[PDB]
């Protein structure tokens, strides 16, 4: 008549542990973000990117994601991640965005037209402001031409707005391009120093090696369960196995090219897989003329 099959009760996922974590506590909490004219270009790769710590850091004045969805930040994987750290004023935060033009945007740092990532900003009046004044931070307000996206300029040539060569000295129509922010505790919001770290995500023709951390569920044994072991998916009953694997081997297959054993990613243990019970169902019946019992 039909087939009888035991449905899985629970779903189990086992992935290798996340002992590798991206250096988010290095791009943030660096205690010195240099200046916007010379922005720190840090490469983040070959690590699991967990945004839980990023949320667990200080409340963000501006956390806007353009290319990568805030929900899918962990889901999406990228080959390389670039974080740019710099200190800018409150009103200069808006200029760091796609399609926005301003002094900082054109002469210091330009987000590309098709930028993918999230702009992270938070207030830094406590650390970056001193009563004497934080003259260390600088920005550029004079330059010959607009900067192309993702460019760094650190060379100070006396701006020749006039018709006569400056000869490398300051004077009439000869101004040093660099100008200093001054940060004091009494400054109002909008001129207070703001710390911005721009997360840039790029896809390259290579393995991503940067996938958000993936959760692990407790192992269920001797029960019909759905299982996803390090990318190997199936339905079955997981039992203890006498078989001994080699260190590099992770799966086991039989003569029929079907999976029969799997090595548990977290604790190295060989678990044999038995297909969940299935079988035909037959109805033994005397003639319905005689009786209806079966």
């Amino acid at each position: 008549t039909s087939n009888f099959r035991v449905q899985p009760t629970e779903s189990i996922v086992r992935f290798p542990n996340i002992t590798n974590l991206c250096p988010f506590h290095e791009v943030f909490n660096a205690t010195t973000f240099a200046s916007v004219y010379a922005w720190n270009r840090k490469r983040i790769s070959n690590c699991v990117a967990d945004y839980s710590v990023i949320y667990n850091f200080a409340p963000f004045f501006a956390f806007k994601c353009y290319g990568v969805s805030p929900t899918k930040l962990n889901d999406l994987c990228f080959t390389n991640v670039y974080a740019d750290s710099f200190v800018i004023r409150g009103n200069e935060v808006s200029q760091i965005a796609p399609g926005q033009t301003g002094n900082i945007a054109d002469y210091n740092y330009k987000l590309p037209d098709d930028f993918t990532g999230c702009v992270i900003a938070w207030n830094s009046n406590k650390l970056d402001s001193k009563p004497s004044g934080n003259y260390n931070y600088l920005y550029r307000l004079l330059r010959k031409s607009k900067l192309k996206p993702f460019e760094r300029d650190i060379s100070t040539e006396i701006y020749q707005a006039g018709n006569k060569p400056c000869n490398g000295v300051a004077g009439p129509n000869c101004y040093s391009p660099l100008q200093s922010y001054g940060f004091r505790p009494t400054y109002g919001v909008g001129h207070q120093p703001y710390r911005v770290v721009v997360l840039s995500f790029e896809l390259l023709h290579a393995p991503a090696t940067v996938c958000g951390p993936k959760k692990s569920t407790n192992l269920v044994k001797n029960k019909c369960v759905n299982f996803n072991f390090n990318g190997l998916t199936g339905t079955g009953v997981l039992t203890e196995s006498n078989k001994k694997f080699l260190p590099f081997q992770q799966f086991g297959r039989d003569i029929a090219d079907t999976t029969d054993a799997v090595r548990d990613p977290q604790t190295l243990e060989i678990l044999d897989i038995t297909p969940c019970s299935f079988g035909g169902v037959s109805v033994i019946t005397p003639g319905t003329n005689t009786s209806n019992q079966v």
Binding site: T186, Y187, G188, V189, G190, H191
Partner: protein, 100 residues
């Protein structure tokens, strides 16, 4: 708009008294770069209330023209600034406002 948290923190609206020595002429200060303060030894009187209105009118003017360049960061002529103060002072003392 309404006053800044920095304004509330830095401004001295009450007479310190005792050891502290200060001038008690009311003044609204636009120190620059987003700092606004009132230097006023304010007591609980109707004249002090109206003077507070006048000074906060000054600060609202200063906040409004903050965006413009430094040289132009002033009233259009010498009269408009105290005029903007005085209109608020006049409106504050109206019996309708007092009853409200």
């Amino acid at each position: 708009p309404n006053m800044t948290q920095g304004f509330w923190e830095n401004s001295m609206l009450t007479d310190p008294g005792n050891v502290q020595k200060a001038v008690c002429h009311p003044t609204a200060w636009d120190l620059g770069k987003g700092d606004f303060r009132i230097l006023m030894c304010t007591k609980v009187t109707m004249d002090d209330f109206l003077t507070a209105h006048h000074e906060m009118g000054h600060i609202q003017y200063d906040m409004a023209y903050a965006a413009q360049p430094f040289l132009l960061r002033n009233g259009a002529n010498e009269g408009f600034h105290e005029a903007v103060g005085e209109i608020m002072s006049l409106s504050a003392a109206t019996p309708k406002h007092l009853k409200s």
